[PDB]
Every structure is written in structure tokens, then in C-alpha cells.
Design a protein around this ligand. Structure first.
Ligand SMILES: Nc1nc2c(ncn2[C@@H]2O[C@@H]3COP(=O)(O)O[C@H]4[C@@H](O)[C@H](n5cnc6c(=O)[nH]c(N)nc65)O[C@@H]4COP(=O)(O)O[C@H]3[C@H]2O)c(=O)[nH]1
Ligand SMILES: Nc1nc2c(ncn2[C@@H]2O[C@@H]3COP(=O)(O)O[C@H]4[C@@H](O)[C@H](n5cnc6c(=O)[nH]c(N)nc65)O[C@@H]4COP(=O)(O)O[C@H]3[C@H]2O)c(=O)[nH]1
Ligand SMILES: [Ca+2]
Ligand SMILES: [Ca+2]
Ligand SMILES: [Ca+2]
Lengths: 307, 312, 307, 312, 311
């Protein structure tokens, strides 16, 4: 799916925030402003950058000279929200764009804060346009290399990859001929089923998906592990290439953790919980795809398939 | 081990931070201050928050009425802006569940900032008689001990790894062994079982290879357990010479390999050696995994007295 | 149905109670005052605040200076009735609105009691209107999230859901083709019939409802239980989608629970027993709907239909 | 087990509360006072009522002529309104059926507060000879024992769960088996049957999974029974090994899974561990479920000597 | 040994270079200036920066406001010579091993390809300038933090050390740690130590040198079976000086490959060794030893069990 970007700004900076959102939207991006219709339960602008700021891939903060409530000074509120945004989104996923006359620094912890002139027609300013273009270019290169972070879904994907997918690929590639359930195959494909959402238990969902698709079970012996690899094979749609299937079970762990940490004494899901679940699924899928594409033995033999 | 607490302050808050650190050490804690010898690579007092402030269990912010003025700090044009930005960065790095704040009277900070109470105390030379600061530190200690005793959880990679490992392997193994009228593993009958989970000392070696050589050195033999909670049998390791009356089972978690390689991929630049931040992150991940696993084990009647977490 | 809200007040707070009731009615709420025409058998304001106050979704208390009979002091009466209110409605279903200057603590066990100026034309006080708006917003938010309590109907709904409805949906979704009684279906819908009232035995009522509507019986084999799931299918109005029916049986248990609990030395039903019956039915329906809507395998496949 | 009684009082009524508690243990009761070491998370004596006072079978208050004055309490501006509000909260948590009250001479509380008798007793240093207080405690004990002996029930979730489970499964099973001239289950003839209901010790494990592993551990075989009281046959479990002359049937109620899940969703915040209030609530739910099931079994001729409730 | 640092400057700016060399020398560093007695065969400074500049761990370049005019030696303008030697220095030493120090008024940038070029004021007594002193201190701190983490580059000795480590030393340590008891040549040991013999120089064939070292020290061969390789690990054991802790020995053979490569690259029709060849050999040996030690110290199974010992 498209990359999610959060834009934080004060009440006076909605014009700049909307212009930046539109410009990013024309660049095939998903953009949410701090007062988006998603963040209605949030009371003020401070707690939306505390609760649902890290739930986005990147973030942009806009500073306004005029903005210089909770605190006793607008300057204090601006610097506090800047610090909170930078801490929540780190130094690799955070970007800043202060207007001309704003007296914030320009090299805060490795994050540049370019200055743009305050005008009325924003389809005229070369400086603001080129700064937004630089931000877009930086975001586009990070997504293509595969910048990683200690997110739980990223670690889950890395562990799942190295301990199951690479082992399966090595075991299948180390066979002079592929003999699965007594049937010979001249090639194989490894399909990883990623659930559309974390609204159901992963184990039962995987079991019922296998039952509905009528997928049998295979056992693969590997020298890279002390116990065999257990998989699922089609046996009906697989004529010449072995069609193997698997739904990751670590997703059960992330679902249980999200349920424990989010769910208070209520049954319904808050907006923050839903955003966190979608973010975890997106990072898991993206990290798994990036890990797959960077190995010669798993590149064209493993495909990530939606449920 | 002990609970690690990070204390952030300004250049003039060293007295307050040192007193708080000493009083916390009196309460069986492991306190680190922003100016400690661990954080030497951090050039200023702001990168020590962006880097290692989130690597501690809890954090305390001390604010004094000396940085709430208009002066120069070589980073922000005003020291007040610098201290407010530092407070915001601290809160963002540690969140609303692991951040505590102490301010002296006269500071312009709020008192109900995003669910974080910031009590005021009267500054004095002798802090052993300061009732206000002493009682606020007492409340901080009480809250920290309460959140450690329940099991307050947070989406850290190690916490999620421990939860997944527990739910998918440990509970399933305990249910499989408890659903047997007699425990017959490798053709030997046992009247009881104990499931030892071996946590590595560190993450400086590959977890799979380290577990394999640990099993070889201790001479532990593999077993297979059939379960109704999974589509394929659970594979474990049994001792078979020291397990005469009670079946002794061993397992080194493999998700620790995933977290180890993730940390290697993230923190390690083009250098062989490990930075202090990487070591702190690995220690925090390992400790959090062990603590979360212990908390999950102790909150289930089927695993409370049958699974023991043992250091390598 | 509309949310039921109870207003507790003394004899001199009647104008405030009527104003709040009118505002909540304009805010799409059902409001009953302590001296409503339904609370006629109740003698004083204390026994009606003990017996039928917990039978409403939420509650509002109003304090007045003039009240500062059963006790020897009116102030003692007011604080005692406030305590009884809090004990009946807990900390999540209780709200309070004291008039200006009232000396009640403002953080009584986590419940705020805002102060409003005592005027004559109640369509003028900004403070009272914004406090009522805040109360309405809080109530509306705690209904969209599914806030849950320890009511027997809620527990019955949770158990019924997780033990029957989720199992049935998982069993039906785990089928490569839907084959019920030898008829192939391309989809299915599960209809749960909730009785209009608890004035009849649930088992016999379900049987007669089925035999009027002419619904057959089916058996479904599931891996989530030790014995097969038994349902009811239409087979006449179901052409391509399997239309299933079921009346919950625990409703009989709760029905006879109220039957034995309400000291039935007579034949007719008192007002408290009746209002409790609709409260339990409403809570059961709401909890079941919230549980259904939060599972991907039951969301669009289960429908709660009135009898 | 024993009957739990909660005693609520002020900070100066500790002597009377201790005396009454001691007499109730002399009368075979399990009494907890608001200042006990179990109610530590409750910071004051007001949160002790709103949280755990409704988790006890019965409750008793002692009121003294020390807090019916005008003083400071840091919560209410006067101690008189504080004690009256505390009385009201206690009554609201416990109602008119499970609450008892005691006042000494000089207390301004009424004596017929909504059907709750509040007798007056004389304060003295040597309380073992106070005829009024001793006879009021005796009357309270008599009333409590009368309530326990009779099937006194309230709208608790566990009580409704037990009523539904009984009247929908146990009575139907007993009627189906008693309507058979001979008991033939799985092709084996028996001259009599016994139905054992397995109540788990605690709610720390999934009830369905725990029942399944218990059945596997005891090698228990499933049976199907046809009945005219329900549209589809009843499914039960039989031993087939120890049932030589009388058929033994085992069944762990599944609605206990419902109450366990409801308690987990309600009481558990973002923490792995269990609070004291949650543990007390789970114990109370299990006790009321077992008590209601036993009372319903004993209040029917077709189930009194044929169904037995046994712990796990 | 002490870290090697090269300072390049012009003839008219040798006083700043000498002061920087002395200041680094007081900081436990080995410093050579382009006009040192080692680089006599080199004709000019340009040839020195092309041949031996990369043979040092780090490099420092000094620019002054006296060779920036439109004067007249290899190029036409002394401006061109300065910018050319700066480019050659930065290319030879890369961006992780190059440092610059221009004087006040110099025209060079301050963020040239990631290499900061601080400006200092030119005086007569350099034990007075706070700016130059703090710039040299910053350079020293950067070099110190680089040497302690283990910054690595694609040098042949670094790659040789990495391959040798991960293919022999780690495998040997895992094989020995995966033994319930250590049984080498029929003798039981309760502990082991792995000694890696690094030759003092590359002036002799590594294979024959290792063989004669083993013969002189009377070290016997052992065979170790491992699950991390398809064929066993062959080592050497003392068997006389090892009573309770087994003492194992090995001289790396990849040093033979690096010695052969250096001999093939540098010898061009003579028997004696050029100073550049000697510097390259010392650099390769030092980087091999340092990389091996760094790799050893960052593994729990090899930290206290493997020691790097001089011949
Ligand atoms: N179909 C299939 N999928 C596989 C297999 N092995 C791994 N996976 C997938 O890879 C994920 C990560 O496995 P891990 O690193 O070994 O980390 C595992 C491991 O440490 C431990 N564990 C799980 N199963 C076993 C086992 O059978 N034996 C042992 N000794 N440990 C196990 O629990 C961790 C989390 O397990 P999961 O939730 O299951 O998540 C697993 C699972 O989704 C396999 O043989 N077949
Ligand atoms: N049409 C239909 N509805 C179903 C079926 N299974 C469950 N339900 C519905 O789900 C409700 C909750 O079931 P529970 O949690 O298992 O809790 C149940 C269970 O523990 C026990 N029970 C009931 N029937 C059986 C049975 O056939 N076998 C066994 N072993 N236990 C049963 O009595 C508890 C309360 O039973 P209920 O009042 O009936 O309420 C039941 C019933 O209305 C089914 O196969 N068909
Ligand atoms: Ca979920
Ligand atoms: Ca590592
Ligand atoms: Ca040579």
C-alpha cells in the first residue's frame, strides 16, 4: 500500500499543512494531518503526537513564526511539540519545515529544518517546493533500500525469515530432485499468506484457510535445524512447480501483544489500536519482502500473497 | 536484575539528580544519570536522550529554576526553549508510562502534562530534611514498584517476541505434557516434568549455534511431543541422565536469534566493535524478554510451577 | 434502542433535572427522573435510588445549596444519596453536576463534579451547556468502544458468543464448499433471534418460532469443540446463501434468574423486574453485536434479528 | 469454603472492627478489614469500597461517635459528611441484603435506613462483657447463617451462569438418564449413574483447553445421550474403566470460560499480572458459581443424590 | 603498536605540520611528515602522496595562505598544485581516514565531501592558539573513537583476517565449546586456549616459517571434528606446557597469500625491498592483527579463549 506520512502543525499552519499534504498526495503518498477525521478522540494537538505519531512511516512538522494553551507560552508549546514529535518518530522518520522568520535551529540532532517564505499562493514558491521535493526524494530512497527500525513487526519478520523461510529455501534447493509427499517436482514456489487484518486469531484463521483451500501437509528435513520443517502443499493446483503455503504464526504473537497493550475494559477497537495493527502488518510484509528480495535463493522462489 | 532508571537534567541540576540517584539506590535500583561515563560518545545532553533514554526501564526528569530564563546554550537561542525541548524529547522517548518528572518551585512547567504529574519541591541545601522532594521520590518509587509488580507491558520487540514464544511454544508444550496420563518421552516413563528455558548471557554469538553447542556440551538429547494444539509435533530436548524421577527439558528460544540479528542490522555501522548504545539495547532486550517470559509463566496455573527460566 | 439515562436530584433540583432531561432528549437519549410516572411504588428518593438506579445505562446527580427527612440533616441526606448513587452505578456509569459553589469534592473517586451557575433562564448558561455537552460526548464515546461491565447479561453474551457463534463461523469458514443437508451453498448468513421480552420460556418460544417459520435442523462438525455444532436452516428462502437461525438458550437462564430473584410472592411483575428485564435484553443484544462486529469471521456473516 | 465478610470502619474504629472480626473467626468466618495487607493498591478507605467491597459475601460497618463531628480529612471538608458518604457507598456496593451496620451510642445515623437495622451499643474498654454488642454480633451471625443455609441468591454473573448451566444441561441429562429402563452408554450396561461436575481450582487457564487436557490426562471417553428435552443429543464424558457397576460421568462447565473471558476483558488493563481486585473477583465468581450449582442440585429430587460437585 | 598518521603540507607550511606532529606525538601516536627521512626515494610531495599516503592508518593535510596566489611547480599555478594534492590525498586515504586543517583566510570549503576543514589562525608560538589546539584535539578524539570501535575498510589484510576468523577460529572455538569434555590426542583437558602466532614480518615464507616454529617449540598436530564444516579442523597442541588448560597453536596461512601478493606487486627487478614495500608489509600485518583481535573480542565464545601472540 501507499506510504503513510503524518503532518503536525499548529492552528495557524493548516494552510501550509494542507499544501504539503496535497503535494505529497500528488507524489503517491498517504497523508494525515493532526486534525484528521481519524484523530477525533484525541483532545488536543499534544496527545495526538504522543499516541498516534509513531504509528506512521514518516512525519513532517511545520513551524510558524506567528506561533512564537497547555503551557503558558505559545513558544513553549511549539518547542515542546517539536521535541515530542522528534522523540516519537526518531531521527530517521522525522522531517521539519519551518517558515521564514521562525527561530528554531537548523541542525537539531541530525534533522534539518529548512526555512521557506510565507506567501499566499503556494503554487509559486520555489524554496518550499524544492524542500518538499527533497523530503519526498529522501523518503523514496529510504523505502527502496529498506531502512529498518526496532519495531516489533520488523523483528518478527527478520526472525521468521531467517529461521523458517531461508531454511526452507536452502532445504529445497539442496535436493537433487524435489520429492514432496511422494510426488516429484522440477521446481517450487513458496507462498506466504499474510492476513488482511489482525481481527481474528492467527492459528485458527490459518487452519481454516488451509481447510478451505484444501492444502495438505509436508515435512522437509534440513541440516540447518535439529528438527524438520513442516509445511503445506497444494497437490491439486501444483502440476510441475511445487506450490507451498504458510501463514506466519509470529503474527499471532504481535496480535496478542497489541490486544494486551491496547485493550482496556472495552470490546471495540480504538483508532490508535487499528492504526497500530495496520502499521505492524505493513512493516511485517515490507520487511519480509525486502529480506526475500535480497537473497538469491529466495528471490524468485518466495512470494508474499494476501489472504 | 535491578530496575534501570535514567535521570536527565541540565548542567546545573547535578545536585538534584545526584541526590535522587542516591535515594533510588537506597531503594534497590540501578540509576544512571545523563552525565555518567557510559554516555561519552554523546556530545551534548540532547543526543543522550535521542539515543539511550528509551533503553532504560524508567526515566526521571529534574527541572530547576535556573534554565527557565533567556540565555545562550549553543543549541537553542534560549535556554528555556532548550529545557522545554529536552522535556518533550524525554517524554516522547519514554512515553507516558515510563516517564517521571520533578520540578522545583518557580519553574514554568505545567502540572498535568499529558498524564504526567510534575510535582513541585522547595530547593534547599540539605535534601535529607526536604519533606516535599523526599515524598515525591517516594511516590515515584511506589509507582515504579507497582508497575514492575503487575507486568506493565509495552510494544517493545523483546516483549512481543516473549509473548509470541510463550503463547506458541511454552503453553502448547505444557498443555501437551499435562494431557498425558503418564509422561513417556523417548520410551522412558516419568512422574513429573520441569521445563527449563535457557536464556543466553548475551547476544554476542549466534543464538542457533550457541544453543547447539550448549546442548552438545551438556549432552542433551532431542525428543518429540505430539500435541492437539498444533498441526505438527513439538520438538524439545531432554537430559536423560539427571532426569530420573522428574523429566528435565531444555530449550533456548530461537526468536532471540531474530532480535539479535535485527539489533546487528540496525545499530552496527561499518565497524567490528559495538557501541555503548548497542550494548545497552541488547541488555534491555534480553532483560525484557526474560522478565516478560517470567511474568507470562507466573500468570498461568499450567506453567507457574512447571516452567523455570534459567540463565545460560 | 435509545440509551437510558437516570437523573437523581432532590425536591428543589427539579428545574435543573427537567432542563437536563430536555437537553438529553434533544441529544437522542432516553431520560427518566427519580419521580417519574414509572417509579410510583417507590416511597422516598432513597429506595428508588437504590432499587432501580442500577437498571439504567448511566446516571446524573445534581446538588443544590438549598439542600445543605430520613436523616437528621438535609446535608447528610444529600451526601448519603450521592454515596448510594456511586455504589449503584460505579465509577464508569455515574456522572454528577453540582450547582455553583457546592462543597462536594471535585475528584470523588475519579468522577468530576463540575459547578454550574444557578440562573432562571437555563438557555443562557454557557458553563452548564458545555458541561452537559461534555457528558454527552463521554457517554457517546463509551458506547462506540463497547465499554463492558460485570452484568450477568454481558457475561452471558460473551460466553454465548465465544463458545457458540465464533465456533460456528469458524466451522463454516473452514469448508471448501458449504454443504448443509446435502445442498450446496456459495455463502452463509447466521441469524440470531432475540426475543422481544422475557415473559415466556425461551426454549418453548424458540421451538414455536421455528415451527411457525418451518426451519429444519442441521449438524456441523468442528475442530474447535469435542462434539458437533447443531443449528437450524431454512432450506426454502435460502437459494444461494445458507440462512441459519438460532435463539440463545442462556436467555432462559437469565429470565428465570430474575424470576427467582424478584421475591415472587405474587403473580404480576413489578416495575423493577420489568425494567431489569429490558435492561438485560438490551445489554445482551448490545454485547453480542459488539462482539460480532469485532471479528472478521463473524462481522458480515452474523445478523441479530428481532423476533 | 468459608464465608468472606468485609468490615469497614474509620481510622479510629479499629478496636471494634478487630473485636468483631475475631468473634467472626470464632464463628468460622474469613474476615477482612479495610486496613488489611491485601488492600494495598487502594490509597484510601474510599477506594476500598468502590473496588473490593462488593467482592465479599457479606459486609459489616461499625460507626463510632468520633467521626460524627466537624474536622478535616483531606477528602471531605468534614468527617461527618465523609462517614455518611462512606456509609452510602458501602450500602450501594452491598445493597439491602448483604450489608450490616453497627453504631455506638451518640451516633446520629438512623436505625431503619432502607430496611438496614443499625443497632446501638455501649462503648467500653473491656469489650468481652458488652451485652449489647455481643448480642448484636450474635444476631448478625444468625442472620448470615440463615441466608447461607437458604438458597439466597443475587444477580451476580456467576449465579446466573450456574442457574443457566444447571437448568439447561444437568437437569436435562438427569431426566434423560432417569427415563431409561437401563443405562446403556457406548454399548455397556450399567445399573446406576453418577454425574461429577469438575470445577477448576482457579481461572488462570482457558476452561475449554483445561477441560480437554484433563480428559486426556484421566483417559476419559466421550458419550452421546439422546433426550426429549432438547432438539439435539447431549454429549458427555465417561471413564469406562473405573465405572464397573455405576456409570461415572465427567463434565467441566464451559460457561466458566465465559466468566473467565469477561473478567479478563473487564479487569485487566495493559499489564500481564493480575491485580488483587481481579483475583478477589475471580475467587468470588468461582465460589458463587459452585455454591449456586450445589444449591440447585440439592433443591431437586432428580439431581440431589445423582450429581456431585468436585474440585479439579 | 602506536597508530600511524601521515601529515601532508607544502614546503612553506612545515612549521604548522611540525607542531601538529609534536602534538599528536604527545598523544601516543606515530607521525610521519611528507619530508621525513623515510620518503627519500620519492621525488616530490605529489609522488609521496600517491605511493605511501595510503599506507598509513590516517592522514592530515595542512593548507596555508601562502601557496594560494597565481605563482609558478608541476602545475602552472601553485593554486592548482594545492588543490590537486588535496584531491589526491583525499582519494588515497578516503573519507574515513582523511583529515584537513586549513589556516585562517584559506579558500577551501568546510564540508568537502564529508571532510571538515576547520580554519585556524597562523601565529609564531603555537602553544597559544586555542582554535588550532581544539581542532587537533577533535581530530585526536575522532581517531581514538574510530580505533576503539574497529572501523574497517576493504583492505586485503582486513578481508584476510575476517575470512580467517569466521572460517577457522570461530569454527575451532565452537567445536571445542561443544565438547562435554576436551579430549585432544587422548588426554583430557578442563579448559583450552587458542594461541595465534603472528609473524614479526613478512620477510620469510609463511608456511616454512610456521613449520620451523612448530618444530622448534615441539608442537604436535591434533585433529578436531566440527559440525560447522565438511572436513575436520587440524591444529597444533603443546602437550608439554599444557597440564590442565590445553594450549593450541596456529600461524595463519593467508599471510602467505598477502606476502606473495605484496612481493608480486612491488618487486620490479631488484632483490632489496623498497621503503614503500616495507611500509605496505607492516601496514598489512598490523591491520591483520588488529582486525583479528577486534573480531575475537566481540564474540563470547572467542573472547577469553583466543590470544594473539607474536612469533
Ligand atoms: N509451518 C512452520 N512454521 C515455522 C516452522 N518453524 C518456524 N516457523 C515459523 O517462524 C516463526 C519463527 O520461528 P522461531 O525463530 O524458531 O522461534 C520460535 C521457537 O523458538 C519456538 N518454537 C516453536 N516451535 C518449536 C519447536 O517445534 N521446537 C522448538 N525447540 N522450538 C519451537 O517458539 C518461537 C516462535 O514460534 P512461532 O510462533 O511458531 O513462529 C514461527 C513460525 O511462524 C515450522 O517448522 N513450520
Ligand atoms: N443451537 C445450539 N446452541 C448451542 C450449542 N452449543 C451451545 N449453544 C448455545 O451457547 C450457549 C453457551 O454455551 P456454553 O458456553 O458452552 O455453556 C453450556 C455447556 O457448558 C453446557 N452444555 C450445554 N450443552 C452441552 C452439551 O451438548 N454437551 C456438553 N458437554 N455440555 C453442554 O451447559 C452450558 C449452557 O448451555 P446453554 O443454556 O444451552 O447455552 C448455550 C447455547 O444457547 C449447539 O450445539 N446448538
Ligand atoms: Ca486481534
Ligand atoms: Ca550480535
Ligand atoms: Ca616476503
Amino acid at each position: 500500500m501507499r506510504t503513510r506520512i503524518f503532518i503536525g502543525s499548529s492552528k495557524e499552519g493548516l494552510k501550509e499543512a494542507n499544501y504539503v499534504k496535497s503535494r505529497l498526495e500528488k507524489a503517491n503518498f498517504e497523508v494525515f494531518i493532526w486534525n484528521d477525521d481519524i484523530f477525533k478522540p484525541n483532545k488536543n494537538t499534544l496527545e495526538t503526537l504522543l499516541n498516534v505519531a509513531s504509528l506512521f512511516d514518516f512525519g513532517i512538522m511545520i513551524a510558524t513564526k506567528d506561533d512564537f494553551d497547555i503551557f503558558e507560552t505559545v513558544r513553549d508549546n511549539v518547542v515542546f511539540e517539536f521535541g515530542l514529535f522528534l522523540g516519537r518518530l526518531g531521527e530517521n522518520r522525522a522531517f521539519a519545515l519551518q517558515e521564514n522568520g521562525a527561530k528554531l535551529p537548523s541542525d537539531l540532532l541530525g534533522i534539518t529544518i529548512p526555512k521557506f517564505e510565507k506567501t499566499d499562493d503556494y503554487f509559486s514558491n520555489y524554496n518550499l517546493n524544492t524542500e518538499i521535493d527533497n523530503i519526498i526524494k529522501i523518503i523514496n530512497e529510504k523505502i527502496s533500500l529498506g531502512e529498518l527500525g526496532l519495531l516489533p513487526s520488523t523483528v518478527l519478520a527478520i526472525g521468521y525469515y531467517e529461521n523458517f523461510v531461508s531454511t526452507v529455501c536452502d532445504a529445497l534447493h539442496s535436493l537433487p530432485t524435489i520429492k514432496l509427499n511422494g510426488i516429484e517436482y522440477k521446481d517450487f514456489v513458496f507462498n506466504i499468506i499474510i492476513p488482511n487484518d489482525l481481527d481474528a486469531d492467527i492459528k485458527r484463521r490459518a487452519q481454516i484457510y488451509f481447510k478451505k483451500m484444501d492444502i495438505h501437509e509436508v515435512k522437509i528435513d534440513t541440516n540447518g535445524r535439529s528438527f524438520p520443517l513442516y509445511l503445506q502443499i497444494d497437490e491439486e493446483n501444483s502440476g510441475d512447480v511445487a506450490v507451498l503455503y504458510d501463514m506466519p504464526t509470529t503474527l499471532g504473537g504481535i496480535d496478542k501483544a497489541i490486544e494486551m497493550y491496547m485493550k482496556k475494559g472495552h470490546i471495540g477497537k480504538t483508532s490508535q489500536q487499528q492504526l497500530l495493527e495496520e502499521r505492524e502488518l505493513r512493516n511485517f510484509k515490507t520487511t519480509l519482502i525486502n529480506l526475500i528480495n535480497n537473497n538469491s535463493f529466495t528471490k524468485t522462489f518466495v512470494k508474499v500473497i494476501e489472504e
